Design a protein around this ligand. Structure first.
Ligand code: MG
Lengths: 507, 136
DNA sequence: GCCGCTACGTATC
DNA sequence: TGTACAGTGACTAATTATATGTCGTTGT
DNA sequence: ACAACGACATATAATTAGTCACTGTACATCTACGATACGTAGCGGC
DNA sequence: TGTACAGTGACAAATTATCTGTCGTCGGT
C-alpha cells in the first residue's frame, strides 16, 4: 500500500533547523557549500558533523527529519514480561463474570505473588495502573462506538430469520413495541395510581405514527389488537383534544415487524394476521427497530419530562418529588399525548430526508388510496376457541359459562370454532367447518344473561373466587360472584375505572 | 497557493468532458518558486526555494465574452472547463514574438536539460486542504 | 374410558 | 469542622536510545 | 587538499518507575419481579 | 447503514468600550 507521512506543529525548535535547511537547498560548489555549513554552525551551536547529519536526515525523510523522533522504548514497560503478563491476566480474570476487580485489588495480587516468589521489586501500584491503562481505554472506546444510518430512500429491515424486508412504500412494514411512560398518574380523586403503558404502531417507510394505545393495562395480545384497530380504522377526535391538523392516517399493513414478546409471538396475533392478510416477523436485536425505539426517547424529551409527576428514565435519575407532585389523570395524559402526535410529531421533518414531513411522506408514499374497512369486519380482532364441541341439548361450555344458539341443537356431537370478545363474553359467534372452510352458524348467548355484560377477566375472577368458595357452577352463580365484588378499593379495579372512563369518552 | 502549486507539479490527466484537442503535457519540480511559514515548509519538504502575466489575455480572449461577465447563468465547473480548454488548446499553443518558431509549450519542452521524473502523488499530500477532527 | 375446565412449568418483555 | 479509600497531577530517581565530537578511512 | 561516511567514545534528554499531597465520590433499605404468552398435566362429571 | 433530537466547536456579521492620531491648550524652563 501507499505509506506517506506529514509533519505538523513543526516550529518550536524546528524553525531554526528549517531556516538552516533553507540556507542549504543547493550544492552550489564544493568550495562554497562547506562555507554555508560552517556558517549554519553559528545558528545551531553545533559542529560540522551535526549539520551534515541534519542535511542527511532532511534529504531522506523531508520535514519530519527536522523533528526529534520518539525513543524506541516509548510504550514498553521495564518491569519485565513476567510481571506484565501477570498484571494483565490478573485484571482480566478478576473482571470475569460478575467480578469487578479494581487495579488496586490487582496490585494486592501483585504483592501477594511477589511475596511467594521472594521478589524484592514487585511493580508499584502507580505502574499497575499504567500497565492496565491501554486495556481500560479499549473498553471505554468499545462502548462509545457510533453507527451511521440509513441514508436516502432505501431501507432493508433485518429479521431473526436472517432475511431482510425491503421497505418499498407506505404501509409495507408496520412496527410495534411497548414502553412505560415516565409520569405517575392519579385517579379522578387525586390519589396515586401507576405509570401508564404506551404502545405505538409506526409505518417504516414514512416513520409516521400510525396509531397508539395508552392505559394502565398490561402488555397483552389484547393491547396489541387494540393498537392495531386504532392504527387501521380511520381516526376521529373531538374538540376537547383541541387539534389544529388531522391524524389523517389509516389502512392495513402488508407486514408487521415486532420484538419477541409473548403479545406478538402468540396464536391471537397470528389469527389477526391470517385474517387481515399480513405476515408477522421477528426483530433480530433491539437495534434493528430504532424506527420504534427512538420515538420513545423523543416523547421523554419533548413531552413527558416537562409534565408534573415525571419519574426519570431510571431510578438513579428519579426526581424525589415524583410521588408528591403527581397531578394528571389518564384522560389528561391522552389529551396531551394525542395532540403532541397530531400537531407536532407527525408534522415534523423526516430526519433521513430533511425536506418532507413524516405525514407528507406517508400520504405521498401510498401506492394507492386504500378503502376503509367496515368497523364490523374488524371483528377478526375476536379471540378464537379452537375445538370446543357441541353438547346434546344444543349447548356449549366456555369459561364456566353455558351458551345456547339458534340452530345449535342441529349439531350436537360436532366441533365448532367460537369467536369471542374479551370485553364482552355474554355472546359468542359460532363458526363450523364445512368443505374444509369455516361457515358462519349462529350468535350463541349465555342463557339467562342476554340482558347482562361480562368481560373475560370478570368471569375469570368470579370463577377463581367461586372455585375457592366451594359453590356450584352456573351462569347466575358466576354473576352472583361478580355483583358483590362489583358493588363493595383495589388498585387494579381503581385503574380499570379510570381506563373505562377514557373508553367511555371514545364512544 | 499550495493547491495551485500541487496542480502545477503533478501530471494533469484531464477528462473527456473538457473536450480537449491538445494534451496539457507539463509536470515537474522547479528550481525556484516566486509568490505573493507554510509555503517555506512546502519548499523545504519538496526541495525547492520559495521567494516572497496571462491576465490581460484571459480577459480579452475568454472572460469578457462569457455569460454573466460583470461589465444569464454559469456554474463554477463550467467556467473551469472553459478555462482549461482555453489554456490547453489556445494560450499555451500561442507563439510569442520572442519565441518565433516555438509555442509556449514547445519552448517549455525544448528548453529542458532533461525530462523530469514525476513526483509520486503522495509526496504532494501536504498541499491539500485539511479537516482536523473526525470520528470513525 | 372420554371430555370441557383448573393448575403447574417454561419463556420473554 | 462526616468519612476514608481509589484515582490523579506535580515532581524526582533510574534506565536508555540517541545526538555530538574526534579521528581514521575512502572518494574526488 | 576538500568532502562524505563510519568505528568508537562520550554526554544527553526522553521514557518509565516511584513518591506524595490534594481530591472526587459512594456509605447512606432496595430490581428480582410483574405481566403476558404457550405447553402440558390433572379432577371429577358423564 | 438504527434512529433522530439536544447539545456543541468553528466561523461570519452587528455592536461597542477602547486604542491612536492630530490639534489645541496649559504648564514648566
Ligand atoms: Mg417489547
Amino acid at each position: 500500500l501507499e505509506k506517506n507521512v506529514i509533519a505538523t506543529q513543526l516550529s518550536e525548535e524546528a524553525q531554526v533547523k528549517l531556516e538552516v535547511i533553507q540556507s542549504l537547498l543547493e550544492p552550489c560548489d564544493r568550495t562554497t557549500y562547506g562555507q554555508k555549513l560552517r556558517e549554519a554552525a553559528e545558528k545551531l551551536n553545533v559542529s560540522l558533523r551535526t549539520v551534515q547529519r541534519l542535511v542527511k536526515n532532511w534529504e531522506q525523510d523531508g520535514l519530519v527529519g527536522l523533528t526529534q523522533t520518539s525513543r524506541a522504548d516509548k510504550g514498553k514497560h521495564r518491569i519485565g514480561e513476567f510481571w506484565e503478563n501477570f498484571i494483565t491476566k490478573t485484571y482480566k480474570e478478576g473482571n470475569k463474570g460478575s467480578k469487578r476487580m479494581t487495579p488496586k485489588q490487582v496490585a494486592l495480587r501483585v504483592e501477594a505473588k511477589a511475596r511467594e516468589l521472594k521478589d524484592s521489586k514487585p511493580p508499584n501500584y502507580k505502574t499497575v495502573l499504567r500497565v492496565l491503562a491501554p486495556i481500560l481505554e479499549k473498553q471505554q472506546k468499545a462502548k462509545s462506538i457510533r453507527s451511521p444510518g440509513w441514508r436516502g430512500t432505501t431501507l432493508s429491515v433485518k429479521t431473526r430469520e436472517g432475511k431482510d424486508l425491503s421497505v418499498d412504500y407506505s404501509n409495507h412494514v408496520w412496527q410495534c413495541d411497548h414502553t412505560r411512560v415516565d409520569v405517575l398518574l392519579v385517579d379522578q380523586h387525586g390519589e396515586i395510581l401507576s405509570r401508564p403503558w404506551l404502545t405505538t404502531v409506526i409505518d417504516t417507510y414514512s416513520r409516521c405514527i400510525m396509531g397508539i394505545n395508552l392505559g394502565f393495562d398490561a402488555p397483552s395480545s389484547g393491547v396489541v389488537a387494540l393498537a392495531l384497530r386504532h392504527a387501521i380504522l380511520p381516526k376521529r377526535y373531538g374538540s376537547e383534544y383541541k387539534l389544529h391538523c388531522e391524524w389523517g392516517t389509516y389502512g392495513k399493513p402488508e407486514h408487521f415487524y415486532t420484538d419477541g414478546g409473548k403479545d406478538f409471538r402468540s396464536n391471537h396475533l397470528s389469527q389477526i394476521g391470517a385474517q387481515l392478510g399480513f405476515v408477522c416477523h421477528l426483530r433480530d436485536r433491539p437495534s434493528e427497530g430504532g424506527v420504534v425505539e427512538r420515538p420513545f426517547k423523543t416523547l421523554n424529551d419533548q413531552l413527558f419530562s416537562t409534565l408534573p409527576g415525571y419519574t426519570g428514565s431510571n431510578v438513579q435519575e428519579r426526581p424525589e418529588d415524583a410521588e408528591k407532585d403527581a397531578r394528571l389523570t389518564l384522560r389528561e395524559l391522552e389529551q396531551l399525548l394525542v395532540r403532541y402526535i397530531v400537531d407536532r410529531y407527525n408534522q415534523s421533518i423526516d430526519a433521513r430526508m430533511g425536506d418532507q414531513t413524516r405525514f407528507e411522506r406517508w400520504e405521498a408514499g401510498l401506492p394507492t388510496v386504500p378503502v376503509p374497512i367496515p368497523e364490523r369486519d374488524l371483528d377478526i380482532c375476536l379471540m378464537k376457541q379452537s375445538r370446543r364441541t357441541v353438547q346434546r341439548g344444543g349447548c356449549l361450555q366456555f369459561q364456566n359459562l353455558m351458551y345456547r344458539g339458534e340452530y345449535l341443537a342441529g349439531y350436537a356431537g360436532e366441533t365448532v370454532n367460537l369467536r369471542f370478545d374479551p370485553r364482552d363474553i355474554t355472546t359468542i359467534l359460532v363458526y363450523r367447518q364445512e368443505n374444509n372452510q369455516e361457515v358462519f352458524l349462529t350468535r350463541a348467548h349465555a342463557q339467562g344473561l342476554e340482558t347482562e355484560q361480562l368481560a373475560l377477566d370478570e368471569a375469570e375472577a368470579a370463577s377463581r373466587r367461586l372455585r375457592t368458595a366451594g359453590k356450584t357452577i352456573s351462569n347466575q352463580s358466576l354473576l352472583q360472584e361478580v355483583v358483590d365484588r362489583d358493588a363493595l378499593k383495589e388498585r387494579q379495579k381503581l385503574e380499570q375505572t379510570v381506563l373505562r372512563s377514557a373508553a367511555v369518552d371514545e364512544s
